[PDB]
Amino acid sequence: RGVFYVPDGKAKGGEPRIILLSFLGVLLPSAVLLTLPVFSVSGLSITDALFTATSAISVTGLGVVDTGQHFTLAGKILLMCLMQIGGLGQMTLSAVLLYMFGVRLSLRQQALAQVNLRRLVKKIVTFALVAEAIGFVFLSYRWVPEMGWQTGMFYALFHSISAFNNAGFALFSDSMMSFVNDPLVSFTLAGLFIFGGLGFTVIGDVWRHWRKGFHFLHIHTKIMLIATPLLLLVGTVLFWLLERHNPNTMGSLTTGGQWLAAFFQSASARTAGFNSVDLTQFTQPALLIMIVLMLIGAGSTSTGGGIKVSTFAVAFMATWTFLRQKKHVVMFKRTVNWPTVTKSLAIIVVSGAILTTAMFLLMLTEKASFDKVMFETISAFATVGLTAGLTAELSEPGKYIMIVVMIIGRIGPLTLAYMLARPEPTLIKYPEDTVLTG
Amino acid sequence: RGVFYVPDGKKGGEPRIILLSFLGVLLPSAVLLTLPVFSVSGLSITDALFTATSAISVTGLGVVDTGQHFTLAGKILLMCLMQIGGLGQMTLSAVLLYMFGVRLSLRQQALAVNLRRLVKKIVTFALVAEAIGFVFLSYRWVPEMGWQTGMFYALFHSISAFNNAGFALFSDSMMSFVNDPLVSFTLAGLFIFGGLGFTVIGDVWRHWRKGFHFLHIHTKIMLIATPLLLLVGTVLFWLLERHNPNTMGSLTTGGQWLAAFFQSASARTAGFNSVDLTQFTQPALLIMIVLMLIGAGSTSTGGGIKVSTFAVAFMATWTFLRQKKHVVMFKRTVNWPTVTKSLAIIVVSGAILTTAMFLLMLTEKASFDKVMFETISAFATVGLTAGLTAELSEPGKYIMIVVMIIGRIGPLTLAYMLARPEPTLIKYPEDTVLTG
Amino acid sequence: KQFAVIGLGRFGLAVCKELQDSGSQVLAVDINEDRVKEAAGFVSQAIVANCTHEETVAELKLDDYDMVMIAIGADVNASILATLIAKEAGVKSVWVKANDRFQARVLQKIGADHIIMPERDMGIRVARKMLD
Amino acid sequence: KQFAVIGLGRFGLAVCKELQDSGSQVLAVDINEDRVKEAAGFVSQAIVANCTHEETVAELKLDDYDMVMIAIGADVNASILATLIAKEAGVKSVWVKANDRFQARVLQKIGADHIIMPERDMGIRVARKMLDK
Amino acid sequence: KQFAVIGLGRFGLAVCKELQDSGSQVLAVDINEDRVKEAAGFVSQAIVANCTHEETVAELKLDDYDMVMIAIGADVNASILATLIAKEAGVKSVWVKANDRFQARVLQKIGADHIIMPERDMGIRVARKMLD
Amino acid sequence: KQFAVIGLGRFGLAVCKELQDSGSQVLAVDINEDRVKEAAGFVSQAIVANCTHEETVAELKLDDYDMVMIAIGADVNASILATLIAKEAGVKSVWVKANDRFQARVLQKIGADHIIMPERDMGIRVARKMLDK
Amino acid sequence: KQFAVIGLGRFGLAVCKELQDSGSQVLAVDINEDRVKEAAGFVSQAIVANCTHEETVAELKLDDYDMVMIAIGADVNASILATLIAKEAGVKSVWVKANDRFQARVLQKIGADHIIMPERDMGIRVARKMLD
Amino acid sequence: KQFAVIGLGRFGLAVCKELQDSGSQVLAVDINEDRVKEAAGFVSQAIVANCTHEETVAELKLDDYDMVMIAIGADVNASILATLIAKEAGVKSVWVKANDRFQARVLQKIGADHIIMPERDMGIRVARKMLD
Amino acid sequence: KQFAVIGLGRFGLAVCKELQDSGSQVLAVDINEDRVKEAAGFVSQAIVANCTHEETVAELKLDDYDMVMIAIGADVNASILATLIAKEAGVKSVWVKANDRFQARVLQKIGADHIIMPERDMGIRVARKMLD
Amino acid sequence: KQFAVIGLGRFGLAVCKELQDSGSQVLAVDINEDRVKEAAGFVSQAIVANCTHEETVAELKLDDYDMVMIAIGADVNASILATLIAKEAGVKSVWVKANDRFQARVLQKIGADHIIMPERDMGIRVARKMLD
Ligand SMILES: Nc1ncnc2c1ncn2[C@@H]1O[C@H](COP(=O)(O)OP(=O)(O)O)[C@@H](O)[C@H]1O
Ligand SMILES: Nc1ncnc2c1ncn2[C@@H]1O[C@H](COP(=O)(O)OP(=O)(O)O)[C@@H](O)[C@H]1O
Ligand SMILES: Nc1ncnc2c1ncn2[C@@H]1O[C@H](COP(=O)(O)OP(=O)(O)O)[C@@H](O)[C@H]1O
Ligand SMILES: Nc1ncnc2c1ncn2[C@@H]1O[C@H](COP(=O)(O)OP(=O)(O)O)[C@@H](O)[C@H]1O
Ligand SMILES: [K+]
Ligand SMILES: [K+]
Numbered sequence A: 001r002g003v004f005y006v007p008d009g010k011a012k013g014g015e016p017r018i019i020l021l022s023f024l025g026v027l028l029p030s031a032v033l034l035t036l037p038v039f040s041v042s043g044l045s046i047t048d049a050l051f052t053a054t055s056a057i058s059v060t061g062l063g064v065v066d067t068g069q070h071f072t073l074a075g076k077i078l079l080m081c082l083m084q085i086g087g088l089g090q091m092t093l094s095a096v097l098l099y100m101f102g103v104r105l106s107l108r109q110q111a112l113a114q115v116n117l118r119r120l121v122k123k124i125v126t127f128a129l130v131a132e133a134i135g136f137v138f139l140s141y142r143w144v145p146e147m148g149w150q151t152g153m154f155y156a157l158f159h160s161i162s163a164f165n166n167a168g169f170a171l172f173s174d175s176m177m178s179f180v181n182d183p184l185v186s187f188t189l190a191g192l193f194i195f196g197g198l199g200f201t202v203i204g205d206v207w208r209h210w211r212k213g214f215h216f217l218h219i220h221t222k223i224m225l226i227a228t229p230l231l232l233l234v235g236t237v238l239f240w241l242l243e244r245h246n247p248n249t250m251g252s253l254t255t256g257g258q259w260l261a262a263f264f265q266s267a268s269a270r271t272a273g274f275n276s277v278d279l280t281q282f283t284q285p286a287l288l289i290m291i292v293l294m295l296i297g298a299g300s301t302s303t304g305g306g307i308k309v310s311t312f313a314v315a316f317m318a319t320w321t322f323l324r325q326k327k328h329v330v331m332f333k334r335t336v337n338w339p340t341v342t343k344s345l346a347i348i349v350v351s352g353a354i355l356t357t358a359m360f361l362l363m364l365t366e367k368a369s370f371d372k373v374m375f376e377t378i379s380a381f382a383t384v385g386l387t388a389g390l391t392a393e394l395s396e397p398g399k400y401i402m403i404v405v406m407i408i409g410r411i412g413p414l415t416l417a418y419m420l421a422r423p424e425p426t427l428i429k430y431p432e433d434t435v436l437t438g
Numbered sequence B: 001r002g003v004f005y006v007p008d009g010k011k012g013g014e015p016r017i018i019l020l021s022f023l024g025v026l027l028p029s030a031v032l033l034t035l036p037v038f039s040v041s042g043l044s045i046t047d048a049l050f051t052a053t054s055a056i057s058v059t060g061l062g063v064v065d066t067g068q069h070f071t072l073a074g075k076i077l078l079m080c081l082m083q084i085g086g087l088g089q090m091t092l093s094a095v096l097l098y099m100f101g102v103r104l105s106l107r108q109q110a111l112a113v114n115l116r117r118l119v120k121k122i123v124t125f126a127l128v129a130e131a132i133g134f135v136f137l138s139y140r141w142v143p144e145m146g147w148q149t150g151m152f153y154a155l156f157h158s159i160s161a162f163n164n165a166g167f168a169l170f171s172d173s174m175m176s177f178v179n180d181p182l183v184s185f186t187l188a189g190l191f192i193f194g195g196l197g198f199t200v201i202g203d204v205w206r207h208w209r210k211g212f213h214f215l216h217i218h219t220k221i222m223l224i225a226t227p228l229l230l231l232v233g234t235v236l237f238w239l240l241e242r243h244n245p246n247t248m249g250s251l252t253t254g255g256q257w258l259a260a261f262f263q264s265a266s267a268r269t270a271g272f273n274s275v276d277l278t279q280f281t282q283p284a285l286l287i288m289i290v291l292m293l294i295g296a297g298s299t300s301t302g303g304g305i306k307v308s309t310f311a312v313a314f315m316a317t318w319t320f321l322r323q324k325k326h327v328v329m330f331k332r333t334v335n336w337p338t339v340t341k342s343l344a345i346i347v348v349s350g351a352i353l354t355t356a357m358f359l360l361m362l363t364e365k366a367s368f369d370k371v372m373f374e375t376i377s378a379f380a381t382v383g384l385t386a387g388l389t390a391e392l393s394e395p396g397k398y399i400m401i402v403v404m405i406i407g408r409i410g411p412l413t414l415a416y417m418l419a420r421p422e423p424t425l426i427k428y429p430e431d432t433v434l435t436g
Numbered sequence C, E, G, H, I, J: 001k002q003f004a005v006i007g008l009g010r011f012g013l014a015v016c017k018e019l020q021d022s023g024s025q026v027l028a029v030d031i032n033e034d035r036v037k038e039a040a041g042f043v044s045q046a047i048v049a050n051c052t053h054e055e056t057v058a059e060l061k062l063d064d065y066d067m068v069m070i071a072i073g074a075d076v077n078a079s080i081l082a083t084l085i086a087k088e089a090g091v092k093s094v095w096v097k098a099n100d101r102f103q104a105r106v107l108q109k110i111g112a113d114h115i116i117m118p119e120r121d122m123g124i125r126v127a128r129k130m131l132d
Numbered sequence D, F: 001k002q003f004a005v006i007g008l009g010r011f012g013l014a015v016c017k018e019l020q021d022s023g024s025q026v027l028a029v030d031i032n033e034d035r036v037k038e039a040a041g042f043v044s045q046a047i048v049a050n051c052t053h054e055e056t057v058a059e060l061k062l063d064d065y066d067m068v069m070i071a072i073g074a075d076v077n078a079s080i081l082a083t084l085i086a087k088e089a090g091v092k093s094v095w096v097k098a099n100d101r102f103q104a105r106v107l108q109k110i111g112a113d114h115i116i117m118p119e120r121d122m123g124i125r126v127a128r129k130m131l132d133k
């Protein structure tokens, strides 16, 4: 309908400010709420409540305390709402900013030479509820007979929301450890964060243009529809190869159980948080592969992720273009322009710089092996929330650092994307000089 | 004089020159090292080729002891090989840069000092610096070891330090000289000057009278970053290791600072270790890994991604965070292709390092910190070991060899592939891909 | 009281400045964002919009405003089309800035309320001021 | 009263209309023969000439007229140069048309007696007329 | 039924739209990248290429396509060069838009199989419509 | 069968030639006399006149003609104005050729019965010939 | 003793060379980046900027500089407007290169302190040189 | 002190003016008659002629004059040719004006005694005036 | 036997193609790298060089080649300077391709052995071919 | 013995000179009044006209002349049009000058009997002179 906007006023991106205040505008009121003893059986410390509130809003799922026991029924519902706000809130907020970014692009194109925002938000909410509804009934098919009518629905509806939102919060002491060989819950959860971590743009593009075929889909949709099954396949096969002979975590399973555990871990590695198998007794070569999977994350307009799959895909094919010394980066017979290539490369290098300082700080505040420090830092930054045992023994300074890593990792790649999009214009430019690289 | 060239005929072609030069110098050295004239007991094909790769790539990593396993003929062979590695890499980079500048100038003319003297200046600088190091080291080693043994070790270690090779004739490299400042600064100055870059040395030589302001942007970046990197490395290593009993706890106040400075300077692709890295704490190991990655200057004897690449990446990140339109260093705009080159070098190096680390953890069974440290050391040409090189397997030796070869020539090769790619007559429409 | 100005060129910006000085609510609409920012501090509300698009004009309730100025001068076609959309949208009074006499014939004869050619009108008055 | 009009654009033709209908005698100057032919129908005297040349302006005897109008719109250089030549000739009163504020202040420095900027002036008066006062 | 349309102007896009809607795969070529973007949505494959260069046409593999349309209207010389190079490339059927009678006869002499003059043909057939 | 063609361009001559061969009475109007002489031997009556002048159109009596064809492409503003005059004169059917979609969208809101974009119309119509060759 | 040279043509580079060699720091400003790169070698600071924009001159802080040379030769409008903006920016001394006597009188009337006509001045001095 | 000036542009007119003011007999040659008429009042003798025409130069008897100015700026080729004819005729000292460094280098290498580049020389000397 | 041609345009490329097909070693030198690539296959040695520069011409030993062709057409000053530098360097025979009669006259005055006027020589030739 | 030359460039002037000096009668046709005046000093008949318009071509009756020479160099379209209309008129033998190979092959397709490329023909002939 009406394609227009009101300019902010007297020319730098204000969208990073919108994202930053939106996240801080909900974390602080949620933090003081968790201090009230109505939500916790015994009460939480200011640091513990802040860490829990950050993990719920970031939907990282990292817990300094046990979710199932330390929180009351009111607290469990409070956690339920927050992971709606963290996952669906970002998914809606990213879609709203993406919609408004295109509107400014469209009007500037008209000056030189689509549904409305309210309509778009309705589909985002509708998709989230219908997806969680499908997960709810399938999860209720098993848990209701086991635990009863009222407990069965609550656990089913809790985990349907958590899985779709990429939250990873589990009401059991061990996250999905009791369902290693159970396909119903393992696949119901898997589908929830696979499509939850797929992006509204991918779902929306497939919804509106599936009849024209795959060839006429958007470039971003084609990337996600190929890389996500490719990442799931390589994750499942490579986890299976490195863990089939380890007695501690996966060696005592059936042949079908071998692949179910391998697939579930790979699917949850891409920012879900559930772990069918134990990560403490999980071999180092498989730790690195999961670390890569956590970084690659989910889609751009999804419920969770680190750097997104499209960001990894562009840099991966930029490298292929560079080694074959092609002039343009090309996928699906489309040229990826250099600013997009710069955005993909800049996000990786900035994230790596943040990760290195965060990793360095943790080994100072707490004393543990480096393989544990790197794994925890990636999980907090990539918002996966998979732990390797260092989270339980975290110190007070370590909790503060991990809160900052969770906040920066949740908004960083999306915020740095928009800073690169609209830099402040300058009337004074300096001469260009060549700097030797290599 | 004459500014001209003959076109190749008919993609980037200097990567081919670099690759064929490296291979055609590596293979004869590997063939020679099998001969029992150079080794007292003889070397296996895998071990000999590993030694040849370490010598040509001037990594300095040793599957066998340098001082014992090699004879006098082999010891002289190592000197020639590490000369070839370091000085030949410097000279080849300078020649390729000269030819690139010639082509740039000719195309600029079309739109709108010669090579021989440049090579002579590179050799003259190397010999003068190596002679200064030789005399400074002979001032100490000759009295305590004899007239001809003293000169030989002094010359060998001057050659190794200037060329950033790190090969030492003692069983423990520089462990016996923790508190001795003469050899410490003599070696330190050699790979600081050797790793500074010939471009920086020449720019300071020819334009020091105009002042620092009128120097070239690369020279200013190096002259600011190298002292800054040395200072931050010294401070961090002193802070993180001054209470560890195994390395720096037992030393004196001056000795602790000397060891910290020496480790900070040698982490930048030199390879000498005054202190033991096996008993070295984890945060300091991460700091040293970062220092090895940052490396030495561009047209130098060092390795890894160069200091200028890291500086451009840092300033580009600062510009992105402040949302400035242009990356500006010393009141000069760094064009977007240079930023893209720096970021691409970092990303490609990271991907190669990840694959190499996964392969090493597959073939070899060791903790992640050891494997990651060894991979960074091999790729960055530094050659500092954490106890994993001695326990390598044969596939591990092959993987480490490949990492050494790719690390020594990679960043310069990836820089020159971006320098002038294949032109295309067919272009596809541009489409937007969501990032972040 | 409430005024709408479409096109924020030399003529459009001048209209907005006086309308704000008299304490009136003025709406500035322009296709180019850069020009909207210049007039942002001189109007009550500043919107970047395309008044050639019929649905965009529908959302911005121009029929509620008492007077509407179409101050587009460069494109003869855009000014004619914007005027015709405004009339069918329900605007009672539409004032149009015309750069040439040929356009002024079309705009008046399709139903524009007032026709303004800046170059001609000062041509009359400058002569009158010289006469007396 | 005798008036001189330099430039025969939309502004100059309107000035010629009003002045001729007011009973005065005017002289019209333009460089394009197409515009002067249209103006020759009603003006007292129509001459094709360039007003940026000193000798041509001297031949026209601009000093006789009490009011001289310059209506060169597109070429800012031509407008400034013609104003300077007219002032140096010794015409008592100069009125010049300006398109932007920079040209306006340049003409102010030159010494044009009155400067008319049609776009902003019509903006002002149209706003006043909308305000009904 | 593979088609190649060279020039994606007002005439070219309509040909591409109709051909693609009729179930056939077409190739769109244009030197203006921004105009290639518009056609890239509904065309099987779109390419930014200059068809007046022989090697570019060789890389395009126009010989494989059954029929090639050149819809270059403004640049007469570009249309002549594209038609000539397409004939040397070995296209079986070549269709060329003509804006002038001299251009049409020159194209006929070169070897263009079908020559379309949109103004003249549209005038003839609109006259036929007005007759009936 | 009474017809009138306004604007003797490339499209105008094509309409005039084909329509006359059928045996219908046609009026050719064009501002340029030279193109009228070229169409003199292909039309029954041709008059050199301007159809954007309101008084001239009344003399031509376009109301008697069953169809009027406005084929002015160079001046889009003249095409819009000429369409209004024919509608005011009482012509039942007005056919106007449009070069651009922006001009066409104006013309539809005017009330022109048929809008002809020759380049786009040949786009489908030539392409359909490609399918069945 | 700081100088600012606006315009880096043949005259501007010569002024910058002779000023820098005398031990004084100068600022070089030009819209052509190639000429700024040329001057960047020997000039204390070189800036790619448009001096006909009033905001660009304001952040350049030309008021701090003791004397400002405007050496724009080809574009008369650029020279006139740069001189006007420099004077309105409250700079003490303005030197302008003029290519014509009509430009010279205009620049004098604006308020340029000293006006340089190269062809006339060089002609006078060469004629004087012939005498001795 | 007998002198000749070839070409009556701005530089040539300035040279003739100052040299007549100094009180010396001069002869001025220019291909355009109007500038000859303009300079006739000032110069001692002014003849309309082309100095790229060898027999005309021979008639002019340029070898009598101690110094000659060739001040042709627009046509570099004409300036070089005039310098060659002046040198061949036997002029003891020839001074020629050059607009570009390439023309100056050609003129020096062919044997011009003095090369005048108005923009650069004014550059250095205006800067020197700036110092003091 | 040994030929050197400077400038690889239409004239120079044809010279290379005929001379090499004749069976002699020819040196093709051009400042633009693309033209050198195009002519590289035909000629024995192809060099990208600037023959405007004296040191480059000295390094490329043109004094031993039997005959040297200067085939720059666009730039008159570049062609004159290349010819004069080649004569200074000791080339026995220099043939120059000239585009204008003034350029041909200047080159003849310089001392170039052979002057080639492309369209003029075709003028006489084709006239004679028509006559007989 | 009667010849017609279309286009009065340097090639056309040279061919007219040689044809006249051989005693033939030539007609010189061109669009520029200055060049046709320059030819009129020596041509039997000089007419200023555009040869791309059919009516003038019929009026001056090219068909009478046995040989017609078309020397339009700068405009490729003008040369193509002149050749096409000349062949349409019914002149037995047409000679046309082509600047590049694409123009030459288009002319060959049109029907020009002899095609002259001065640059390449000079290339071959000077190479032959170089050989012996
Ligand atoms: N140097 C000049 N001397 C006299 N008349 C001029 C000169 N330059 C331009 N003119 C005339 O002044 C008229 C101004 O037209 P224009 O610049 O389009 O403004 P407008 O037509 O809106 O008044 C032109 O028609 C032109 O012929
Ligand atoms: N040499 C060429 N090769 C390929 N495409 C071309 C070439 N020259 C022009 N074109 C394209 O042909 C299209 C024809 O557009 P235009 O000439 O405006 O005619 P129309 O009126 O049909 O748009 C242009 O958009 C242009 O990009
Ligand atoms: N608006 C402007 N702001 C700043 N510099 C300008 C502007 N316009 C032109 N210049 C510069 O002034 C210089 C004068 O140009 P030019 O006439 O080539 O100098 P010269 O008189 O030496 O030939 C140009 O190099 C141009 O880059
Ligand atoms: N349509 C035309 N009719 C007649 N003569 C023309 C036409 N177009 C160009 N010419 C003439 O052809 C001549 C060739 O021009 P040009 O290429 O500059 O010279 P040359 O062909 O000698 O290099 C010009 O003098 C021009 O006047
Ligand atoms: K999670
Ligand atoms: K080393």
Ligand SMILES: [Mg+2]
Residues within 6 Å of the ligand: I009, I074
């Ligand atoms: Mg050329």
Ligand SMILES: [Mg+2]
Residues within 6 Å of the ligand: J008, J009, J010
């Ligand atoms: Mg010519």
